[PDB]
Amino acid sequence: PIVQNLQGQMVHQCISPRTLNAWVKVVEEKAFSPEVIPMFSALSCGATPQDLNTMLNTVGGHQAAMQMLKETINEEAAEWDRLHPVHAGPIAPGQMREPRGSDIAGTTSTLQEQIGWMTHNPPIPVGEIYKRWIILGLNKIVRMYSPTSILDIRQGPKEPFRDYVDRFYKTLRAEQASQEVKNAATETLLVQNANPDCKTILKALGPGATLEEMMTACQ
Amino acid sequence: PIVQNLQGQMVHQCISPRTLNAWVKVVEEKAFSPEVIPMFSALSCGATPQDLNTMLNTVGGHQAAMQMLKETINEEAAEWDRLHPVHAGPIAPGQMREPRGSDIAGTTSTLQEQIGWMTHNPPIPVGEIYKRWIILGLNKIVRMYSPTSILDIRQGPKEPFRDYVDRFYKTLRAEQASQEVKNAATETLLVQNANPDCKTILKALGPGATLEEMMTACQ
Amino acid sequence: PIVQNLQGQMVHQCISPRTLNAWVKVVEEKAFSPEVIPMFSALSCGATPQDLNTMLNTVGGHQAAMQMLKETINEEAAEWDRLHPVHAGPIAPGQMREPRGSDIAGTTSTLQEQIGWMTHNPPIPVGEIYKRWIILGLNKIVRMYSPTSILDIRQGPKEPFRDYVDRFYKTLRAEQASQEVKNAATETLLVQNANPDCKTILKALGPGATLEEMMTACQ
Amino acid sequence: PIVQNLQGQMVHQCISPRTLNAWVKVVEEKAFSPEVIPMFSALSCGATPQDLNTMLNTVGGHQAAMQMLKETINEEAAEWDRLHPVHAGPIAPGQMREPRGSDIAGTTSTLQEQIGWMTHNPPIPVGEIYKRWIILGLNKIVRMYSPTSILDIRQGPKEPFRDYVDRFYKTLRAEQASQEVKNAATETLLVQNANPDCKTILKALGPGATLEEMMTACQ
Amino acid sequence: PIVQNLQGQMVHQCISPRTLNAWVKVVEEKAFSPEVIPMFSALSCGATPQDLNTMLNTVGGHQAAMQMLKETINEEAAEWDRLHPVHAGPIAPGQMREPRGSDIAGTTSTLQEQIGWMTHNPPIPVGEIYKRWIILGLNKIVRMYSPTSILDIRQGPKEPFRDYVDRFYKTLRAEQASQEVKNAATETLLVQNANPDCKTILKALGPGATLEEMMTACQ
Amino acid sequence: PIVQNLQGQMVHQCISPRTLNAWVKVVEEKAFSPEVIPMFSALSCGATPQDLNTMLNTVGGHQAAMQMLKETINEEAAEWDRLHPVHAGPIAPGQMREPRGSDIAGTTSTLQEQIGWMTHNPPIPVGEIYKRWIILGLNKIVRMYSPTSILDIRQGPKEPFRDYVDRFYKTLRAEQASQEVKNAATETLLVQNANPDCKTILKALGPGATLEEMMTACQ
Ligand SMILES: O=C1C[C@H](c2ccccc2)c2ccc(O)cc2N1
Ligand SMILES: O=C1C[C@H](c2ccccc2)c2ccc(O)cc2N1
Ligand SMILES: O=C1C[C@H](c2ccccc2)c2ccc(O)cc2N1
């Protein structure tokens, strides 16, 4: 990554064994459960595009996902190039060239060029731009591997309400409902999919009940 | 987080793999037992709002709790906005804008803006303000998942007094009795809920007995 | 804690995940065996009162002990207040207020105030003062949970002398004999509680035998 | 490795126990699965040639591979010497000599000489040059140990499409297909090797289907 | 311990969780096998007397040994006091007092006083002086717990020579033979205690055989 | 070890718990398999002679080897003394004395003297000189414990060629064949010791076949 030293200048630092191991292990253990994404984001704090490729490349399984990811990155790169075409021909000697899509994705740029962009005044944030494309791709993957429609999360006759809600919001998260839909469903689908005894209790609370109030009600 | 370097200026540092892992593991292992809260607080020492979202977002289970938490945070944010309304319209060029509720919660502010607020002279402590809202929400969750009323913690006929007290104060902690009530119960409910042999011993000690004195008495 | 940087000024540092985990694990694994105390002391090297509460609060079991501890801390605080009463009324603007008992224990003081006291010239060592109260309380707990009187540590007919001595001094340590009594018992209770064959060997060595000499004798 | 300190000068640092252990463990656990290569590259960030030999030499098994690697390194070294012959005879006193192939590979150069080259202005990047030769050799090894031709990866009658794709792209990666061939096969061999039910679904989508579209189609 | 910072002044640093844990674990796992001693020495690199007490005090078992250790430390302290008596009466204001035995052992000196002595120009090396006393005591313990006389290490009829030698020198190390005796026994007791077939082979090599030569001979 | 700080002066640093543990564990797990040597070398990067003794002394088993090692070190020391005799009599006040063999091996020199030599301008590299003697000794040990002659590594009738080569070069490495012999055997003993089916395939390839070519041939 690029970090501030103890004296406040922005410099490159090797990606650490702990970072490298953390990411590989979270993928091994969690696959593409939605919480992997914010872990990815945090593990790649200050990453260069080189570092982001490193992390992605160190993944051994899930090659279908990695290939889908590549496709997403290629799509974003191509859009970047549509918006920000670069001058063909020789670079001004000693000067910084403009990044293309593939430069941002780290496949046609050097670490040195990446460092130059990221520490320019002002910075051309190639790491942050690439991380956004990657996360966009990872979110498609999370949705793809979400095994269950919210429509099939229904409370079991002896299933504690709490356990049901946990299933319900876990599914909505993977299915990638917006936060509006998540805040909203408390008044609707959550109640509909509840079991008969809880549904009656909830129906009776009236509208505007918090999730806390619903969960207390059916405890 | 934001930290002082070795030279005393306040700078941003990436959240560490060790921090990230610690929090995820404490939630996996302890759920919402009350001691998770002070662990959360300590793991988020110097956190930006970004870091606080990171920690919360890396949690994979307990989505009912996470949704309740969101609701609590939205309530606090809305109160913040009631107290501290912000000027609509364009920002003074190069100047610091005032934070809204959602800015404090990190959903509408950048890391850069968060850093600007937290390192201003004097600091606008958005991380500390958000951490308070979060802890408020986590405390509601701890109380919600507390499985047992203090009324049902009664000493078993062969249960060592010590083991009973441990159950009793563990329950009071989750049920979230004030410290007055915790200091107070030594003279009352603790004695009432004791078994017959210990109750008689304790009844006889008289009032004003320390907890130490009670435990020695029924050892 | 408060630490010297690489440039020799005293600054606050976040308590580390490793510290936090170490303490929680030592309590889980050792409970209140006497060696937990010096581990506590070393893990809290340079702690603020905030850090000391953190460590104590992260403990999930042993709530009877934690409540006894609170009682001890309240007793010390009340004595502090007897010795060092503080001026009622408004603080001199921009100046440092004097700490009360509860300020030392971290329940009514901020981290900022704690830092101010601890880094004042000369320091008002609120962390060290509070750690003493805590250790005083933890020592009462160690004595309370010591399961065995020294009177009941007697050498078994086939128990190697060494194993007996280990039991004997382990018990004395938990029972909290002074170092005089520990140095002294080599001439008395240690011999009395030895088995018949070793007792005769030891009786015959005469007075002034080192522990080394006793153990060699009954090897 | 060679690193920038906190003050921006390039200095040698001992290879860490964590780095050393990470590499040994990744080889023990993954052998020459393709993801070992980018892990090697990242673990050797800033390595001198000495460090690169260290890592390779600490490997205990896989000696056939290590000997093949040596052969590849000797081939590259010999080509380096063809391109960059060095002056025979005595070195200019106090001056830097030019590196030969074996100097780059660390077998005939000292750590001091390596440091001199790598921190020269401009740097003679002997570590980076050697790492390229090594990776070239490791890629030959990955291809050699790839146990399965892409032609034999065919979807099973009850094998979920996703699991099939994962096998398919895992194999292509080890077999070392170019990225063109990887992007291309989505329209061809991937479809041909699919089972009858999925093949029909895919045949019907038409050309230009993304991998995402194929996987959704056969979900 | 006391360490040099990044700027070359000698300062106190908290003993680390890793150090604390390392020592406790080596004692748990190895007891007083002789290799514990050099581990102790290395783990206490730069220790103050406070740190040395910490390490010793964190040990939970082996209290017979810890009490023997105390006795040894008291003996050394008393000898220190014989050699270096200190002036009774009030200290010169603001000046450094001379250490007594108990000051060196950390029981009557503060951390501040210890730091003052150890960082004086020239240093009064109280940590190093105390570590010597401790090691002296630990060596007595290693000898005490050495379970086997060298006289009873004899090569078994089917025991490989190598395995026998390993037993032999392991025993000599615990029994604490000087290095002369260790270098010497190769010509004597090692041969005598060998089995009949190896003894004849060795007898025939003649005098002056290296240990390497003996081991090759009986391989 | 001796390290450069963040400001470029050469200073002593305590050997770390991680280093100490790494070495002990590699010996426990790998004994004297040849890859232990380069691990030793890397773990002792920047070691003083004190540090090198520490590492060797922390080893608990393998005392036959440790005694052989001592003998090798004594031989080298005695040769050092033959080449570099030192002036008898009193040292020039405040000046640096010349190291003897035993000074280099750390048995008659202090840490201070070692630091003085290693940080002199120019350095008298006592750590590097001693590490060479140690490695010389460790290589004798690796050869001694190599359980199998290369002559007895023959490919089994159903043993995959790859597995055979791995055995073959593992054995050659422990037996300590030169790199000439390792590069050479591909044309000879490797083929001779191959099974009948592979031998014929290899015989037919002709001379000058790479190891890669041989392994592809018999795959
Ligand atoms: O090595 C790479 C880096 C990056 C990558 C790697 C592993 C998984 C996902 C994407 C990538 C992105 C787009 C592309 O066309 C090719 C590549 N190849
Ligand atoms: O991503 C977030 C951050 C934060 C959060 C995350 C995980 C659990 C709990 C709260 C949050 C808070 C309020 C809100 O309306 C939305 C969010 N969404
Ligand atoms: O949170 C705290 C901190 C401290 C504490 C915590 C956990 C166990 C023991 C003592 C404490 C001390 C005295 C008191 O009256 C109240 C408290 N409450």
Ligand SMILES: O=C1C[C@H](c2ccccc2)c2ccc(O)cc2N1
């Ligand atoms: O020790 C070495 C370093 C390097 C190496 C080591 C372990 C595996 C692979 C290559 C190497 C490269 C070429 C060569 O002819 C000899 C060597 N010997």
Ligand SMILES: O=C1C[C@H](c2ccccc2)c2ccc(O)cc2N1
């Ligand atoms: O706490 C201590 C420190 C030291 C110590 C501790 C644990 C084991 C061994 C010795 C010690 C040394 C001599 C003495 O008389 C008393 C003590 N008490």
Ligand SMILES: O=C1C[C@H](c2ccccc2)c2ccc(O)cc2N1
């Ligand atoms: O303590 C030591 C250090 C060194 C050492 C230790 C452990 C194994 C091997 C050699 C050593 C070297 C030569 C010698 O005559 C004596 C010693 N004794």
